[PDB]
Amino acid sequence: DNSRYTHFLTQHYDAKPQGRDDRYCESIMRRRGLTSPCKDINTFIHGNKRSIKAICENENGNPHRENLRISKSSFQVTTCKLHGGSPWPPCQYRATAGFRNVVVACENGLPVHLDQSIFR
């Protein structure tokens, strides 16, 4: 069963963004189905998939907290943060581009959860 890995990619992977601005967030959050209701915070990892999967092995990860894993490499990321009063669309997002390691949970060598706490 690789459905959670697939869902992880949908929610948290975007290989090649250009401008990672507010409009980038507002578009990709719609495109990936994260706007009913508006997700309060969501981060996308850029670059290749193989580096992300590698966090699940010694190659690019260490154990972290309770059964999570933290990457050794740094990733280009973009965090989309909801603003405005309402939980419901249209969903306005503020983009914050960043470059650091990421925390995930892995199952059968595949990432299945991104820990959003490090981007808050």
The parent domain of residue 60 ranges over 1-120
- Say whether 83 is catalytic: no
The identity of residue 35, as a single letter, is T
> Any known ligand binding at 1?
no
80 is in an annotated binding site: yes
CATH number at residue 54: 3.10.130.10
User: Does residue 20 have a known ligand-binding role?
Assistant: yes
Q: Peptide bond preceding 111: is omega within 30 degrees of 0, i.e. cis?
A: no
Residue 68 exposed, middle or buried by CB count within 10 Å (0-12, 13-18, 19+): middle
State how many domains the chain has: 1
Method used to solve the structure: X-ray
12, 46, 64, 83: the catalytic one is 12
Annotation says 113 is catalytic: yes
Q: Are 45 and 77 in contact (CB under 8 A)?
A: yes
